[PDB]
Design a protein around this ligand. Structure first.
Ligand SMILES: CC(C)CCC[C@@H](C)[C@H]1CC[C@H]2[C@@H]3CC=C4C[C@@H](O)CC[C@]4(C)[C@H]3CC[C@]12C
Ligand SMILES: CC(C)CCC[C@@H](C)[C@H]1CC[C@H]2[C@@H]3CC=C4C[C@@H](O)CC[C@]4(C)[C@H]3CC[C@]12C
Lengths: 196, 196
């Protein structure tokens, strides 16, 4: 777990990444993973089991939970991290492949593919930010929700588990994601400026 | 239980009552009592115990039953019979009192008090008919009712016991009451005509 080994691993052995991309982006990425790990099973572990509705209708609990939580926040963030990390993984594999072929026997190609990688990383961050806004308007969760989907008769009151703690972690993850967007834009601008 | 004894009892030993008042009104009165007796404990016995609402809210069953049944049909008819029978009871007691005092020792007074008795009997019938319409619009009861009174959350579905059988007896009692109103009006008109 040598510091130089961890730095080499996270940097992806890329010769075009700048200081922000090799230090700040990696740290924020680690921060999001650690927050997600400590908050996934602990806070969102009983999201559905503890979800109850004030009714005697069989199946109203499950249908109301599905109505109000089409996809859990933890899974949404997990997908966001995987999708955001994919272009970095592709660049790392491409660099390793180039090292392999040159050992068996370019700089502009590496520069261009890195820039495209950062652009796609920024694009994925923006898309997931918009999707999160679309599914869950606002940032705070409420204790009581009004559910009227079939088979629930009329409108029933359903209660969410730990809405305040989930709100706190939602703010943390959203703030970290916003910082990643800002750093990615700065990285793109810095690369373009240095290219001239 | 001699027929002449029952006839003397029901007639009230009144010398001004006509054939309709001494035969038809008494028979319909007996009919209402018999219908009420067979339908009071059997049909309306479990009106509240069998009344259930699709909710987990404690106390919603009792509050919803009170909201939709301010007073049961059986008790409403029981009060109607007592109130309708009161002027007949007063006349019978007054006749007995006059017999008592004359034995110890008028016809116009008996005629007038009988006419007033029939008028009040008609008035009570009309008032209870209007009250029944006011509390229970229409004649048929429904299986499912929508209740939203506190503490029930939002609107809950509550289910009535034997709404069809109660509807049948409601029609019977209402029809008998309407016949009593018609006979009372006929009695008043006949007495006035014979008075001239
Ligand atoms: C600058 C930032 C974005 C760098 C992010 C680096 C991420 C994308 C890279 C760094 C090291 C990578 C890990 C290296 C090895 C493995 C083992 C494999 O069997 C599963 C994937 C896994 C666990 C990789 C997941 C992606 C990973 C964590
Ligand atoms: C022509 C129609 C309206 C006549 C109706 C007669 C009714 C009003 C009269 C006839 C005989 C009466 C009953 C005679 C005796 C008693 C015993 C008493 O301890 C309670 C009331 C009770 C049970 C009376 C109730 C009223 C009664 C039923």
């Amino acid at each position: 777990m040598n510091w130089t080994g961890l730095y080499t691993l996270l940097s992806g052995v890329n010769r075009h990444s700048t200081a922000i991309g090799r230090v700040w982006l990696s740290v924020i990425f680690i921060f999001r993973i650690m927050v997600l790990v400590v908050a996934a099973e602990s806070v969102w572990g009983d999201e559905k089991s503890s979800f109850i509705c004030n009714t005697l209708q069989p199946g109203c609990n499950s249908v109301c939970y599905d109505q109000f939580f089409p996809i859990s926040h933890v899974r949404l963030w997990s997908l966001q991290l995987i999708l955001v990390s994919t272009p970095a993984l592709l660049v790392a594999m491409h660099v390793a492949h180039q090292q392999h072929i040159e050992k068996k026997m370019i700089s502009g190609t590496l520069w261009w593919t890195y820039v495209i990688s950062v652009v796609f990383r920024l694009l994925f961050e923006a898309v997931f930010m918009y999707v999160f806004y679309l599914l869950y308007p606002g940032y705070a969760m409420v204790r009581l929700v009004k559910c009227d989907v079939y088979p629930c008769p009329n409108t029933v009151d359903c209660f969410v588990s730990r809405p305040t703690e989930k709100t706190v972690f939602t703010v943390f993850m959203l703030a970290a994601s916003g910082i990643c967007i800002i750093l990615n834009v700065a990285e793109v601008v810095y690369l373009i400026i240095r290219a001239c």
